Design a protein around this nucleic acid. Sequence first.
RNA 1: GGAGAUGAAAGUCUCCACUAGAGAGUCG
RNA 2: GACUCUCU
Length: 461
Amino acid sequence: GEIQWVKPNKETGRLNINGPTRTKLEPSVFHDVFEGNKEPAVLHSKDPRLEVDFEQALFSKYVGNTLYEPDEYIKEAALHYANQLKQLDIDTSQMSMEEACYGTENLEAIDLHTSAGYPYSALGIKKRDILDSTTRDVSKMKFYMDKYGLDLPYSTYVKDELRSIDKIKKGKSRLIEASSLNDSVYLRMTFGHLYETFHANPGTVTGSAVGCNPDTFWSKLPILLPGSLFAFDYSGYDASLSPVWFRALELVLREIGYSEEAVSLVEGINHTHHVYRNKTYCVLGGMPSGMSGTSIFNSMINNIIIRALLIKTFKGIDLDELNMVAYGDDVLASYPFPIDCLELARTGKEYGLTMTPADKSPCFEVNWDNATFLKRGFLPDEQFPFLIHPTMPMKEIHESIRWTKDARNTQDHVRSLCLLAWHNGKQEYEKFVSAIRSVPVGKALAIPNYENLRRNWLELF
RNA sequence: GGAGAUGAAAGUCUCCACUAGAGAGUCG
RNA sequence: GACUCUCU
Ligand SMILES: [Zn+2]
């Protein structure tokens, strides 16, 4: 991904889009009870904590582009994946505007407590003024579709969230790319059925973990990924995507039988325009965070990437022996023979991808005893060993509990953290629960009982 | 909670990141 | 079926 040009909104006619510049985050009653090192991200140009210029750090994630056209490896990789998807029999027909706006069994409705994007978020128009869950009215939507057209620019906001100390000093806040409801509606109308399929089939045919429930999915993974595991991390996956991968995605979409009209929509996301405050900018490459389909598409693209990386790096790779699962950039994959990722990373750089080792180390072996996916590890149950615990590390659960965007929901926050923490064992969970109790607010909380968490987990099976 | 508008005030009104997934809670 | 929270 690479920024092509920046022009003032005076020159491009774009309305100003401003976001919030002060964090909803404030220290919690458990702030000094647990340890942690994170703080709210830098949201403002003149934050004291800053050690560099803010915006230059904000947009450094667009590292640039390498390949624009698929080579022979990326073609064969698209084709292998594309063929693997055919057994799913995806409905490539256009879904109805009622279904796209208001949902199906396998596709939630358009979120209505959330912004409608350019240009509504500047005209004071909310989604709620155009859509109505109870009416299922597609009347006002089709009017505004033909008022503002399609390909409206993405509204850029800084994400309000906890980041490590470094990323605060160095200015490395995340940006969200808020789509226009007009594009979300169309994207949902063109690929909604593919969405349905992908949500209805987390696993190694889709290669998509989207829709999975870690409590039960974790026990299938060691059967779905047999043999030697490999994994790795990307530095800036979304923004590093060179235009070639959108070309690759187009290869997969056609092979599974999408209309050319449908496939044309992919350039609409390889090449995007954006408004940040009072400037308009152009981005060639890079997956916009906030568009209808980002996760699935990043997940598809990843499937193309691993296949290509494999067959351009090693000789005699049988892609039929690859199993893999992607959640956007997150990956777990297995092959009958160990795959050296030091060499994949080398192939990766050729393709504009920066890959680091998975254990956050500077050397690249991955096994179940140390593999992680969706931030959780894999821990076989001490009683029934074929049942696998996802283990969210207690370090990350400590980071969350120390802050809050509204204390009115402390009770709710702590329960959700306990549903995550208990998989680390009785001894760790009671260490957690008792330190919550160590504070006057903690003694007023309803806290789930470990044996009830365990018992509820086992009835799942 | 923060910001604004208005107003002596009371109040009133307006704003406070996108796409998805998962789990939970509350109510019907 | 709504509304909300926390995670990823
Ligand atoms: Zn452009």
